[PDB]
Design a protein around this nucleic acid. Structure first.
Ligand SMILES: [Mg+2]
Ligand SMILES: [Mg+2]
Ligand SMILES: [Mg+2]
Ligand SMILES: [Mg+2]
Ligand SMILES: [Mg+2]
Ligand SMILES: [Mg+2]
Ligand SMILES: [Mg+2]
Ligand SMILES: [Mg+2]
Ligand SMILES: [Mg+2]
Ligand SMILES: [Mg+2]
Ligand SMILES: [Mg+2]
Ligand SMILES: [Mg+2]
Ligand SMILES: [Mg+2]
Ligand SMILES: [Mg+2]
Ligand SMILES: [Mg+2]
Ligand SMILES: [Mg+2]
Ligand SMILES: [Mg+2]
Ligand SMILES: [Mg+2]
Ligand SMILES: [Mg+2]
Ligand SMILES: [Mg+2]
Ligand SMILES: [Mg+2]
Ligand SMILES: [Mg+2]
Ligand SMILES: [Mg+2]
Ligand SMILES: [Mg+2]
Ligand SMILES: [Mg+2]
Ligand SMILES: [Mg+2]
Ligand SMILES: [Mg+2]
Ligand SMILES: [Mg+2]
Ligand SMILES: [Mg+2]
Ligand SMILES: [Mg+2]
Ligand SMILES: [Mg+2]
Ligand SMILES: [Mg+2]
Ligand SMILES: [Mg+2]
Ligand SMILES: [Mg+2]
Ligand SMILES: [Mg+2]
Ligand SMILES: [Mg+2]
Ligand SMILES: [Mg+2]
Ligand SMILES: [Mg+2]
Ligand SMILES: [Mg+2]
Ligand SMILES: [Mg+2]
Ligand SMILES: [Mg+2]
Ligand SMILES: [Mg+2]
Ligand SMILES: [Mg+2]
Ligand SMILES: [Mg+2]
Ligand SMILES: [Mg+2]
Ligand SMILES: [Mg+2]
Ligand SMILES: [Mg+2]
Ligand SMILES: [Mg+2]
Ligand SMILES: [Mg+2]
Ligand SMILES: [Mg+2]
Ligand SMILES: [Mg+2]
Ligand SMILES: [Mg+2]
Ligand SMILES: [Mg+2]
Ligand SMILES: [Mg+2]
Ligand SMILES: [Mg+2]
Ligand SMILES: [Mg+2]
Ligand SMILES: [Mg+2]
Ligand SMILES: [Mg+2]
Ligand SMILES: [Mg+2]
Ligand SMILES: [Mg+2]
Ligand SMILES: [Mg+2]
Ligand SMILES: [Mg+2]
Ligand SMILES: [Mg+2]
Ligand SMILES: [Mg+2]
Ligand SMILES: [Mg+2]
Ligand SMILES: [Mg+2]
Ligand SMILES: [Mg+2]
Ligand SMILES: [Mg+2]
Ligand SMILES: [Mg+2]
Ligand SMILES: [Mg+2]
Ligand SMILES: [Mg+2]
Ligand SMILES: [Mg+2]
Ligand SMILES: [Mg+2]
Ligand SMILES: [Mg+2]
Ligand SMILES: [Mg+2]
Ligand SMILES: [Mg+2]
Ligand SMILES: [Mg+2]
Ligand SMILES: [Mg+2]
Ligand SMILES: [Mg+2]
Ligand SMILES: [Mg+2]
Ligand SMILES: [Mg+2]
Ligand SMILES: [Mg+2]
Ligand SMILES: [Mg+2]
Ligand SMILES: [Mg+2]
Ligand SMILES: [Mg+2]
Ligand SMILES: [Mg+2]
Ligand SMILES: [Mg+2]
Ligand SMILES: [Mg+2]
Ligand SMILES: [Mg+2]
Ligand SMILES: [Mg+2]
Ligand SMILES: [Mg+2]
Ligand SMILES: [Mg+2]
Ligand SMILES: [Mg+2]
Ligand SMILES: [Mg+2]
Ligand SMILES: [Mg+2]
Ligand SMILES: [Mg+2]
Ligand SMILES: [Mg+2]
Ligand SMILES: [Mg+2]
Ligand SMILES: [Mg+2]
Ligand SMILES: [Mg+2]
Ligand SMILES: [Mg+2]
Ligand SMILES: [Mg+2]
Ligand SMILES: [Mg+2]
Ligand SMILES: [Mg+2]
Ligand SMILES: [Mg+2]
Ligand SMILES: [Mg+2]
Ligand SMILES: [Mg+2]
Ligand SMILES: [Mg+2]
Ligand SMILES: [Mg+2]
Ligand SMILES: [Mg+2]
Ligand SMILES: [Mg+2]
Ligand SMILES: [Mg+2]
Ligand SMILES: [Mg+2]
Ligand SMILES: [Mg+2]
Ligand SMILES: [Mg+2]
Ligand SMILES: [Mg+2]
Ligand SMILES: [Mg+2]
Ligand SMILES: [Mg+2]
Ligand SMILES: [Mg+2]
Ligand SMILES: [Mg+2]
Ligand SMILES: [Mg+2]
Ligand SMILES: [Mg+2]
Ligand SMILES: [Mg+2]
Ligand SMILES: [Mg+2]
Ligand SMILES: [Mg+2]
Ligand SMILES: [Mg+2]
Ligand SMILES: [Mg+2]
Ligand SMILES: [Mg+2]
Ligand SMILES: [Mg+2]
Ligand SMILES: [Mg+2]
Ligand SMILES: [Mg+2]
Ligand SMILES: [Mg+2]
Ligand SMILES: [Mg+2]
Ligand SMILES: [Mg+2]
Ligand SMILES: [Mg+2]
Ligand SMILES: [Mg+2]
Ligand SMILES: [Mg+2]
Ligand SMILES: [Mg+2]
Ligand SMILES: [Mg+2]
Ligand SMILES: [Mg+2]
Ligand SMILES: [Mg+2]
Ligand SMILES: [Mg+2]
Ligand SMILES: [Mg+2]
Ligand SMILES: [Mg+2]
Ligand SMILES: [Mg+2]
Ligand SMILES: [Mg+2]
Ligand SMILES: [Mg+2]
Ligand SMILES: [Mg+2]
Ligand SMILES: [Mg+2]
Ligand SMILES: [Mg+2]
Ligand SMILES: [Mg+2]
Ligand SMILES: [Mg+2]
Ligand SMILES: [Mg+2]
Ligand SMILES: [Mg+2]
Ligand SMILES: [Mg+2]
Ligand SMILES: [Mg+2]
Ligand SMILES: [Mg+2]
Ligand SMILES: [Mg+2]
Ligand SMILES: [Mg+2]
Ligand SMILES: [Mg+2]
Ligand SMILES: [Mg+2]
Ligand SMILES: [Mg+2]
Ligand SMILES: [Mg+2]
Ligand SMILES: [Mg+2]
Ligand SMILES: [Mg+2]
Ligand SMILES: [Mg+2]
Ligand SMILES: [Mg+2]
Ligand SMILES: [Mg+2]
Ligand SMILES: [Mg+2]
Ligand SMILES: [Mg+2]
Ligand SMILES: [Mg+2]
Ligand SMILES: [Mg+2]
Ligand SMILES: [Mg+2]
Ligand SMILES: [Mg+2]
Ligand SMILES: [Mg+2]
Ligand SMILES: [Mg+2]
Ligand SMILES: [Mg+2]
Ligand SMILES: [Mg+2]
Ligand SMILES: [Mg+2]
Ligand SMILES: [Mg+2]
Ligand SMILES: [Mg+2]
Ligand SMILES: [Mg+2]
Ligand SMILES: [Mg+2]
Ligand SMILES: [Mg+2]
Ligand SMILES: [Mg+2]
Ligand SMILES: [Mg+2]
Ligand SMILES: [Mg+2]
Ligand SMILES: [Mg+2]
Ligand SMILES: [Mg+2]
Ligand SMILES: [Mg+2]
Ligand SMILES: [Mg+2]
Ligand SMILES: [Mg+2]
Ligand SMILES: [Mg+2]
Ligand SMILES: [Mg+2]
Ligand SMILES: [Mg+2]
Ligand SMILES: [Mg+2]
Ligand SMILES: [Mg+2]
Ligand SMILES: [Mg+2]
Ligand SMILES: [Mg+2]
Ligand SMILES: [Mg+2]
Ligand SMILES: [Mg+2]
Ligand SMILES: [Mg+2]
Ligand SMILES: [Mg+2]
Ligand SMILES: [Mg+2]
Ligand SMILES: [Mg+2]
Ligand SMILES: [Mg+2]
Ligand SMILES: [Mg+2]
Ligand SMILES: [Mg+2]
Ligand SMILES: [Mg+2]
Ligand SMILES: [Mg+2]
Ligand SMILES: [Mg+2]
Ligand SMILES: [Mg+2]
Ligand SMILES: [Mg+2]
Ligand SMILES: [Mg+2]
Ligand SMILES: [Mg+2]
Ligand SMILES: [Mg+2]
Ligand SMILES: [Mg+2]
Ligand SMILES: [Mg+2]
Lengths: 100, 63, 51
RNA sequence: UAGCGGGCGUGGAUCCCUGGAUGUCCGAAUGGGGGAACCCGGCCGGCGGGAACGCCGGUCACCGCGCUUUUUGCGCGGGGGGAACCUGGGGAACUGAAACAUCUCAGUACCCAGAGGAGAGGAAAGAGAAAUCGACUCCCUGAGUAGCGGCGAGCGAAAGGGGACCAGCCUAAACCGUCCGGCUUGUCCGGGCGGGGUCGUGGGGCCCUCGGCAACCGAAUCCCCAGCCUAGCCGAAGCUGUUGGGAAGCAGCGCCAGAGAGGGUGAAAGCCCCGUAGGCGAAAGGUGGGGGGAUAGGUGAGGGUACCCGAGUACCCCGUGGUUCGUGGAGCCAUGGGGGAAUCUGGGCGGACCACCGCCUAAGGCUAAGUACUCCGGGUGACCGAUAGCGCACCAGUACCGUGAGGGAAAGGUGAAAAGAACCCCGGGAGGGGAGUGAAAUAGAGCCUGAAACCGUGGGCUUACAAGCAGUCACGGCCCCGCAAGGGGUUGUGGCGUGCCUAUUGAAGCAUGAGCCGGCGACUCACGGUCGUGGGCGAGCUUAAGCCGUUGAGGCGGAGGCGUAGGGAAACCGAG
């Protein structure tokens, strides 16, 4: 409830810190923690195997979720704020310049 | 919270216009029996106190 | 009362008092009022008590 | 709340609001028992072959009220809980009086009963001096006045005035109709129902004359609506460079603003995110007189007669309570005991009592608002910031203590992100050393900062012929910082030297207190005085509750208070 926030599984830019500028499709968003996952903030988890089962678990450079406010949507140009506009049937968010 | 005037005082002392405080002379209701006539005439007047006289005033104030 | 007078007065002697009327920038709109103050010596350089 | 292992969602899930469903057992606990959460039944019906057994559904406590032809039953209601607030029935002591007994604390604490979102009170048998006011409640004032008081301590009103709110009603009795019972037929004896009636200009009943009313009032009862509540939605404006682990900083230029409240984002963001200003929204439930409609109700004037107008009541006496009133000259209100009326040419009251003059109608009941509180929701703080703040920031009324009532803690912090240290090495492990992550690991996991007591390793000076509140003054040596005149550390000798606090005539005192460190720890606030002081005003000065306005804004409000006259116990007089 109310947790709703910027973007979902789709393309976005990271205005964060380490990965400022970088851009990629968000492959995961977790509203509980208020954080999203793109293709940056990859981190070295030298940890052995993840789950109790299986052989090697991999040092996977898995993408670490970013604070949901560190990513901004983007559309036919640069990263731009959302502006919810409704048609004649229902409602679809338009960006500040173009649509969707 | 809001001082109560001392009624015992109010009932037997008058505070004069300038600040002084008066009351009757003591010993005059039954002490006599033949005590000089001069006595009772002078015991008839009232007088002014002094230091208690200033203690006295505090017991009034709304008064 | 005296205080209210002396305040207005103190402010008047400084010469920073200013009666007006021609609020051409009516209808609540900041940008408009900005224009009016512009053409009125209120450059926003000094704190203004707008009564 | 991650892990193993499986699923769901734009045929729109999770989630939020509304209504409904299911809700073992105990608990007012209600079939009965009982050591609460367990045990055992009656009756009707169902299931298992189902008689014996078991399960399942329904039902069965008690009290009050109304019926029920009585019986048996049927219906409506009650029971318990609630932070504080409220009313009532009972009701202490410490303490104060510098002892103490009257008195005080106090009708307070507490026990009990009851009511509700409030409760209480409430339409004058009033007030009390004006031939005046006109239910009740609450605030200001009157007022620390009147007065009470071992006239001690101390207690302490009311009228009136300024405000909040604003509302007024229903009965009993005469009298008429009806039903049931009764006798000794009467406008009769009793009882239930309906009509009638309701008050101090005294009213009503019953009679005679006039509308034989349209009308005019009108709810506190209903019904519709607005509005509000229980989810939500829209919501303006920024990019480049730069240092940095990380920009929100810095630099350049730019924009929005009914929005420059606040929070977050790796640091300090009006324009990044949630928001903010300003707007919009309910199928369903709750609220709803603010607006509208309806009904229930309700109303005139003379004349006549003497029918009615609340009984063990009024009234008096005895014993008491309430009030400012402590037996006082002691009324008034209330009532345990005794005597005991009248129905308006009647009764009560205006502080014993009597006359006069006035006020008011007892012995039946109901009534909203203004007021109190804060379990609950929101907002805000010249409120705390983990020894503070609620006892509890944390899995706390817990752990733990007590037979029990009851007592009652401590305990918050990695980082921006878990990236929480693979792998190698020593080790049984713990724990380390490499490596690796990070801006930082002296952020490494009870991990931010990390003070002191306390423990230890290294280094400089120093000490085994010396008598000590442990220091201080001088000189000298060694070591160390400026090559350098200086200064720091140390202490050899010499001079001098009775801890700190408290309490006392007097303490190093063999008088008191302290193991040491850290944190907590004590002259406050309200009201009323008195003096001083800084100001405003000035024979004047000032408002109180409240109202209007704001949302850190103020103004109105003279009721009232102090002062302009004192003296006297007072009547009274007055610069005396
Ligand atoms: Mg969304
Ligand atoms: Mg960078
Ligand atoms: Mg006062
Ligand atoms: Mg006294
Ligand atoms: Mg005498
Ligand atoms: Mg005598
Ligand atoms: Mg004699
Ligand atoms: Mg003599
Ligand atoms: Mg004489
Ligand atoms: Mg406008
Ligand atoms: Mg605009
Ligand atoms: Mg504008
Ligand atoms: Mg889960
Ligand atoms: Mg996970
Ligand atoms: Mg799927
Ligand atoms: Mg389909
Ligand atoms: Mg859907
Ligand atoms: Mg429900
Ligand atoms: Mg439900
Ligand atoms: Mg339900
Ligand atoms: Mg079930
Ligand atoms: Mg039982
Ligand atoms: Mg039952
Ligand atoms: Mg049992
Ligand atoms: Mg059976
Ligand atoms: Mg069988
Ligand atoms: Mg059977
Ligand atoms: Mg059963
Ligand atoms: Mg049964
Ligand atoms: Mg029975
Ligand atoms: Mg009974
Ligand atoms: Mg019965
Ligand atoms: Mg009966
Ligand atoms: Mg009946
Ligand atoms: Mg019967
Ligand atoms: Mg019978
Ligand atoms: Mg019966
Ligand atoms: Mg019932
Ligand atoms: Mg409670
Ligand atoms: Mg009581
Ligand atoms: Mg006593
Ligand atoms: Mg006292
Ligand atoms: Mg005493
Ligand atoms: Mg004493
Ligand atoms: Mg004693
Ligand atoms: Mg006593
Ligand atoms: Mg008392
Ligand atoms: Mg009481
Ligand atoms: Mg009493
Ligand atoms: Mg008593
Ligand atoms: Mg009872
Ligand atoms: Mg109750
Ligand atoms: Mg109740
Ligand atoms: Mg009620
Ligand atoms: Mg009420
Ligand atoms: Mg209320
Ligand atoms: Mg009431
Ligand atoms: Mg009351
Ligand atoms: Mg009542
Ligand atoms: Mg008179
Ligand atoms: Mg008059
Ligand atoms: Mg009056
Ligand atoms: Mg009247
Ligand atoms: Mg009252
Ligand atoms: Mg009040
Ligand atoms: Mg008030
Ligand atoms: Mg006396
Ligand atoms: Mg005494
Ligand atoms: Mg008392
Ligand atoms: Mg009054
Ligand atoms: Mg009044
Ligand atoms: Mg008020
Ligand atoms: Mg008010
Ligand atoms: Mg019979
Ligand atoms: Mg008979
Ligand atoms: Mg009868
Ligand atoms: Mg009769
Ligand atoms: Mg009869
Ligand atoms: Mg009859
Ligand atoms: Mg009637
Ligand atoms: Mg009439
Ligand atoms: Mg008549
Ligand atoms: Mg009304
Ligand atoms: Mg809602
Ligand atoms: Mg809401
Ligand atoms: Mg909109
Ligand atoms: Mg939005
Ligand atoms: Mg650009
Ligand atoms: Mg920058
Ligand atoms: Mg800087
Ligand atoms: Mg700038
Ligand atoms: Mg330009
Ligand atoms: Mg911030
Ligand atoms: Mg700044
Ligand atoms: Mg700052
Ligand atoms: Mg700055
Ligand atoms: Mg901000
Ligand atoms: Mg507009
Ligand atoms: Mg709006
Ligand atoms: Mg809004
Ligand atoms: Mg609206
Ligand atoms: Mg909506
Ligand atoms: Mg509705
Ligand atoms: Mg509708
Ligand atoms: Mg419906
Ligand atoms: Mg409804
Ligand atoms: Mg509701
Ligand atoms: Mg409501
Ligand atoms: Mg209600
Ligand atoms: Mg309407
Ligand atoms: Mg009608
Ligand atoms: Mg008549
Ligand atoms: Mg007659
Ligand atoms: Mg009688
Ligand atoms: Mg009678
Ligand atoms: Mg009686
Ligand atoms: Mg006697
Ligand atoms: Mg008596
Ligand atoms: Mg008495
Ligand atoms: Mg006495
Ligand atoms: Mg008494
Ligand atoms: Mg007396
Ligand atoms: Mg007598
Ligand atoms: Mg009398
Ligand atoms: Mg009696
Ligand atoms: Mg009589
Ligand atoms: Mg009379
Ligand atoms: Mg008479
Ligand atoms: Mg009487
Ligand atoms: Mg009497
Ligand atoms: Mg009277
Ligand atoms: Mg007498
Ligand atoms: Mg009266
Ligand atoms: Mg009666
Ligand atoms: Mg009321
Ligand atoms: Mg009320
Ligand atoms: Mg209030
Ligand atoms: Mg609350
Ligand atoms: Mg609250
Ligand atoms: Mg709050
Ligand atoms: Mg603070
Ligand atoms: Mg702590
Ligand atoms: Mg508490
Ligand atoms: Mg505690
Ligand atoms: Mg808590
Ligand atoms: Mg709490
Ligand atoms: Mg537990
Ligand atoms: Mg807890
Ligand atoms: Mg404790
Ligand atoms: Mg974290
Ligand atoms: Mg990393
Ligand atoms: Mg971990
Ligand atoms: Mg290691
Ligand atoms: Mg190795
Ligand atoms: Mg090894
Ligand atoms: Mg071992
Ligand atoms: Mg190891
Ligand atoms: Mg290392
Ligand atoms: Mg450190
Ligand atoms: Mg170091
Ligand atoms: Mg851990
Ligand atoms: Mg730990
Ligand atoms: Mg540890
Ligand atoms: Mg340390
Ligand atoms: Mg440490
Ligand atoms: Mg240390
Ligand atoms: Mg050491
Ligand atoms: Mg050492
Ligand atoms: Mg050493
Ligand atoms: Mg050295
Ligand atoms: Mg020798
Ligand atoms: Mg010494
Ligand atoms: Mg020297
Ligand atoms: Mg030397
Ligand atoms: Mg040498
Ligand atoms: Mg050397
Ligand atoms: Mg030296
Ligand atoms: Mg020495
Ligand atoms: Mg020496
Ligand atoms: Mg010595
Ligand atoms: Mg001594
Ligand atoms: Mg000795
Ligand atoms: Mg010693
Ligand atoms: Mg001793
Ligand atoms: Mg001692
Ligand atoms: Mg000692
Ligand atoms: Mg001591
Ligand atoms: Mg100590
Ligand atoms: Mg000791
Ligand atoms: Mg010890
Ligand atoms: Mg200490
Ligand atoms: Mg403390
Ligand atoms: Mg202190
Ligand atoms: Mg003091
Ligand atoms: Mg003060
Ligand atoms: Mg004072
Ligand atoms: Mg002065
Ligand atoms: Mg002055
Ligand atoms: Mg002055
Ligand atoms: Mg003048
Ligand atoms: Mg006042
Ligand atoms: Mg008003
Ligand atoms: Mg207002
Ligand atoms: Mg206001
Ligand atoms: Mg304000
Ligand atoms: Mg405003
Ligand atoms: Mg403001
Ligand atoms: Mg104000
Ligand atoms: Mg104004
Ligand atoms: Mg006046
Ligand atoms: Mg005045
Ligand atoms: Mg005046
Ligand atoms: Mg007036
Ligand atoms: Mg006064
Ligand atoms: Mg004067
Ligand atoms: Mg006099
Ligand atoms: Mg004279
Ligand atoms: Mg003269």
């Amino acid at each position: 409830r109310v947790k709703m926030h910027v973007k979902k599984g789709d393309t976005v830019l990271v205005a964060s810190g380490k990965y400022k500028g970088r851009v990629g499709k968000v492959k995961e968003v977790l509203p509980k923690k208020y954080a999203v996952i793109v293709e940056g903030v990859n981190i070295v988890k030298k940890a052995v195997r993840v789950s109790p089962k299986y052989p090697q678990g991999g040092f996977i450079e898995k993408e670490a979720p970013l604070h949901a406010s560190k990513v901004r949507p983007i559309c036919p140009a640069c990263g731009k704020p959302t502006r919810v506009r409704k048609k004649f049937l229902e409602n679809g968010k338009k960006i500040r310049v173009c649509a969707k | 919270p809001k001082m109560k005037t001392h009624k015992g005082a109010k009932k037997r002392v008058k505070i004069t216009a300038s600040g002084k405080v008066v009351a009757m002379k003591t010993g005059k209701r039954h002490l006599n029996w033949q005590k000089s006539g001069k006595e009772i005439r002078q015991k008839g007047r009232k007088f002014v106190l002094a230091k208690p006289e200033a203690e006295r005033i505090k017991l009034l104030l709304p008064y | 009362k005296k205080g209210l007078a002396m305040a207005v007065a103190d402010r008047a002697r400084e010469g920073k008092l200013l009666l007006v009327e021609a609020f051409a920038g009516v209808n609540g709109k900041t940008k408009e009022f900005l224009a009016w103050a512009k053409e009125a010596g209120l450059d926003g350089s000094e704190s203004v008590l707008l009564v």
